[PDB]
Every structure is written in structure tokens, then in C-alpha cells.
């Protein structure tokens, strides 16, 4: 099932995920195209955080759902 990822840059990425797709693997599907590290990748769903050890079904994520991607950069 295809879902959409909204970035702070105003970009909407489309991904093909399965009901048994772990959040950690979702980050991998972004990492290959964006190049952004999964550890820095933070997905927000309805104002809630998505645990890497959880599945899409855990957060009732269905088809055409929009996930927000925010990164917390560290300097020093």
C-alpha cells in the first residue's frame, strides 16, 4: 500500500509499504533515496511518535496516509 511522506522542505515522497513493515524498515526506504540516516529520521503521525520497533498496524496506518518527517540535528 502506497503512503505519502511530507518533509519540512515541502516535499511529498511516495512509498510502497506493507502492513507488516516495521518503522525501522520504512526509514530504510527513505534512506536509499534521501540519504538521510534512519537515526536522524523521525516520523510524526497525528502528532505522535512512531517507535522503530513497531509496525504500521500499531499506529493504524492505512493506505494514502501522510507521515511527517522531521530531523533533530545536533551541533555540540
Amino acid at each position: 500500500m502506497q503512503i505519502f511522506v511530507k518533509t519540512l522542505t515541502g516535499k511529498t515522497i511516495t512509498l510502497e509499504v506493507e502492513p507488516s513493515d516495521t518503522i525501522e524498515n520504512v526509514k530504510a526506504k527513505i534512506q536509499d533515496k534521501e540519504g538521510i540516516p534512519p537515526d536522524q529520521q523521525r516520523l510524526i503521525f497525528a502528532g505522535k511518535q512512531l517507535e522503530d520497533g513497531r509496525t504500521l498496524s500499531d499506529y493504524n496506518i492505512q493506505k494514502e496516509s501522510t507521515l511527517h518527517l522531521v530531523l533533530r540535528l545536533r551541533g555540540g
Binding site: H68, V70, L71
Partner: protein
Amino acid sequence: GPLGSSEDQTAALMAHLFEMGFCDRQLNLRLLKKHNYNILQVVTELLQLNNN
């Protein structure tokens, strides 16, 4: 150099936060001033308040 930054940008940032799941312009405003307009920190800071 510049004369002044467009404060209207704050509205665009606010909208991006409302699309997630907060809908609190007050909390957003007090957070933006906390990190000198840092959307990346605001969203992640707010998430630390309600992540359970």
C-alpha cells in the same frame, strides 16, 4: 546587511505544525521563541511532551 526577516514565515511554520497533531498556536509560539524560530526543535520538543 538585511533590513529585517519576514515575520510572515512564522505563519507557514505554524501551519506545518497544525497538520501534524498539536493545534496549539500558543505552545508553538512559546517554543519558537525558545529556540529563536527553530521548527526542527519545536516539533521534536512538543513530541517529548506527548509521546506516550
